[PDB]
DNA sequence: CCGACGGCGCATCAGC
DNA sequence: GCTGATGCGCC
DNA sequence: GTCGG
């Protein structure tokens, strides 16, 4: 990556603002700048040069000049030495522990992996599982393993009901060589925006995957979204594969394109595209794209028959999944 | 200057 | 119990 | 922190 030092700096700042400062808009600002810089095809020579890019402002330009000149950022150097900031940042690496719980734990004297392990009864279910698999959840998933996981999920889903369609989204669908977790969009013709003609549609699928020992734990689960843990089977004498995060989202079948647009991401691409939609007088979620009335109230869902239809409404040329890794 | 910044599912909790 | 606010998660 | 009105 041409500007890796700068993008790392901005990502670290973003994480600080999110985890410690609890300043969600500064977090988003920093990530937006990191992302636009990441795709810039030149090795940046100055803050001024960077400031030409949408999302990079005066303050980031100044940090960029400091970083280019010295290879570091004093602001970050100090943050890295601050024990409370260090502690809070670490604790938030556990799935289920956010900025608030992290600060609360540090208040109570719980601030290391050892502290967490001996205070399991101070954790909710989600946090308990995040702790259990702390190491595993920070590992990436090789695309080769994602393919094996895809094969199991698609085949087991088929065994439940041949009418289900499961689609692997997230970075996998963007063609990444490695993924952070597995994202599965699920549809069934019994569940549309007009009616739910069959209950337990998501449950049946979760059950089957648990039955074949693919899903190993559950972080949360409702009628349309499952958030849990899974694991590839290993062969005789073979070391086990790491446990992996899996998210499954059941989406009304007639709203598949908005759903797959959403679940394909990236997250920054979605924020950027949805913000552009608003500027264009539309609102996009995982279900529909709707016009904004003169008052700002969302109108009725617009007809959508492809991902491209959505791009057309907001006057964007189509971008294939592989070009949405912002 | 200053309001807006994407949108929503599930878990947990307060107030009634 | 329900409703609404908040935390945390997903892209 | 950055942007647009
Ligand atoms: Mg993912
Ligand atoms: Mg992600
Ligand atoms: Na700029
Ligand atoms: Na966390
Ligand atoms: Na995911």
Distance A273 CA to ligand 1 centre (A): 18
CATH of residue A103: 1.10.150.20
Question: Of A63, A111, A132, A253, which one is the catalytic site residue?
Answer: A63
Tallying the residues shown for chain A, one arrives at 326
Q: Specify whether A194 is located in the same domain as A303.
A: no
* Helix, strand, coil distribution of chain A in percent, nearest 5: 50, 15, 35
Give CA angle at A58 (A54, A64), nearest 5°.
90
For A166 and C2, how far is CA from C1' in angstroms? 35
Q: Specify whether A148 is located in the same domain as A223.
A: yes
Determine the 3-state secondary structure of A253 from DSSP: helix
Footprint of strand B on the protein (CB under 7 A): A 25, 28-29, 124-126, 220-225, 227, 262, 267, 270-271, 274-275, 277-278, 283-287
Distance A21 CA to ligand 5 centre (A): 25
Look at chain A and report how many structural domains it folds into: 4
Nearest nucleotide to the CA of A24, by C1', is B5
Helical axes A83-91 vs A4-16, angle rounded to 10°: 90
**Way it was determined:** X-ray
Which is it for strands A244-250 and A178-179: parallel, antiparallel or unpaired? unpaired
Distance A130 CA to ligand 4 centre (A): 8
A99, A92 Cβ separation under 8 angstroms: yes
Q: What is the resolution of this structure in A?
A: 1.8
Distance A21 CA to ligand 4 centre (A): 15
Q: Which tokens is A138 given? A: 């920070």
Q: Which tokens is A53 given? A: 């890019």
Rounded CA gap, A261 and A256, in Å? Answer: 8
A278 touches strand D (CB under 7 A): no
Q: Specify whether A271 is located in the same domain as A220.
A: no
Can A63 be counted among the known catalytic residues? yes
Which is it for strands A244-250 and A215-221: parallel, antiparallel or unpaired? unpaired
Q: Specify whether A238 is located in the same domain as A273.
A: no
Q: What nucleotides of chain C have any atom within 7 angstroms of a protein Cβ?
A: 6-11
Q: Specify whether A206 is located in the same domain as A306.
A: no
* A window 135-154: Cβ near strand C (< 7 A): none
**Rounded to 5 degrees, what are φ and ψ at A13?**
-65, -45
Q: Of A66, A82, A98, which residue is a domain's last?
A: A82
**Could you tell me which residues come within 8 angstroms of residue A281 by beta carbon, excluding any fewer than 6 positions away?**
A291, A292
Q: Specify whether A165 is located in the same domain as A229.
A: yes
Rounded CA gap, A8 and A15, in Å? Answer: 11
Nearest nucleotide to the CA of A264, by C1', is C11
A255 touches strand C (CB under 7 A): no
Q: Specify whether A127 is located in the same domain as A241.
A: no
CATH of residue A207: 3.30.460.10
Which residue range(s) make up the domain with A119? Answer: 83-139
The H or E element that residue A323 is part of is: none
CB neighbours (10 Å) of residue A155? 11
Q: What nucleotides of chain B have any atom within 7 angstroms of a protein Cβ?
A: 4-12
**Protein residues placing their CB within 5 Å of the ion ligand 1:** A 170, 181, 183
A5, A71 Cβ separation under 8 angstroms: yes
Rounded CA gap, A49 and A194, in Å? Answer: 51
Which is it for strands A225-230 and A215-221: parallel, antiparallel or unpaired? antiparallel
Q: Specify whether A54 is located in the same domain as A147.
A: no
Start-to-end C-alpha separation, chain A: 14
Alpha carbon of residue A17 to chain centroid: 18
Q: Specify whether A152 is located in the same domain as A182.
A: yes
Q: Specify whether A55 is located in the same domain as A152.
A: no
**Is A121 a known ligand-binding residue?**
no
Q: Specify whether A87 is located in the same domain as A147.
A: no
Q: Which ligand sits nearest to residue A247's alpha carbon?
A: 5
Q: Which letter does DSSP use for residue A82 in this model?
A: -
A235, A209 Cβ separation under 8 angstroms: no
A289, A280 Cβ separation under 8 angstroms: no
Residue of A233, A226, A224 lying closest to A206 (CA atoms): A226
Q: Of A217, A242, A262, which residue is a domain's last?
A: A262
Q: Of A237, A262, A287, which residue is a domain's last?
A: A262
The H or E element that residue A248 is part of is: strand A244-250
CATH of residue A48: 1.10.150.110
Q: Specify whether A87 is located in the same domain as A103.
A: yes
């Amino acid at each position: 990556t041409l500007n890796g030092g700068i993008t790392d700096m901005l990502t670290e700042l973003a994480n600080f603002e999110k985890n410690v400062s609890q300043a969600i808009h500064k977090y988003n600002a920093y990530r937006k700048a990191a992302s636009v810089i990441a795709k810039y095809p030149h090795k940046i020579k100055s803050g001024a040069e960077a400031k030409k890019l949408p999302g990079v402002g005066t303050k980031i330009a100044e940090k960029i000049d400091e970083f280019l000149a010295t290879g570091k950022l004093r602001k970050l150097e100090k943050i890295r030495q601050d024990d409370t900031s260090s502690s809070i940042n670490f604790l938030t690496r556990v799935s289920g522990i956010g900025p608030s719980a992290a600060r609360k734990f540090v208040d109570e004297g719980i601030k290391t992996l050892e502290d967490l392990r001996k205070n399991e009864d101070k954790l909710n279910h989600h946090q308990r599982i995040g702790l259990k698999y702390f190491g595993d959840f920070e590992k990436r998933i090789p695309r080769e393993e994602m393919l094996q996981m895809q094969d199991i999920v698609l085949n087991e889903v088929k065994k439940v009901d041949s009418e289900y369609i499961a689609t692997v989204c997230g970075s996998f669908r963007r063609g990444a060589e490695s993924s952070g977790d597995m994202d599965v969009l699920l549809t069934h013709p019994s569940f549309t925006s007009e009616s739910t003609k069959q209950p337990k549609l998501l449950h049946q699928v979760v059950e089957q995957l648990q039955k074949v020992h693919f899903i190993t734990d559950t972080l949360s689960k409702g009628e349309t979204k499952f958030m849990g843990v899974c694991q590839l089977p290993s062969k005789n004498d073979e070391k086990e594969y790491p446990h992996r995060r899996i998210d499954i989202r059941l989406i009304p079948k007639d709203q598949y394109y908005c759903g797959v647009l959403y679940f394909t991401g990236s997250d920054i691409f979605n924020k950027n595209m949805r913000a552009h939609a608003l500027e264009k007088g539309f609102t996009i979620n995982e279900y529909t794209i709707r016009p904004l009335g003169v008052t700002g109230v969302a109108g009725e869902p617009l007809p959508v028959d492809s991902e491209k239809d959505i791009f057309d409404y907001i006057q964007w040329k189509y971008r294939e999944p592989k070009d949405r890794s912002e």
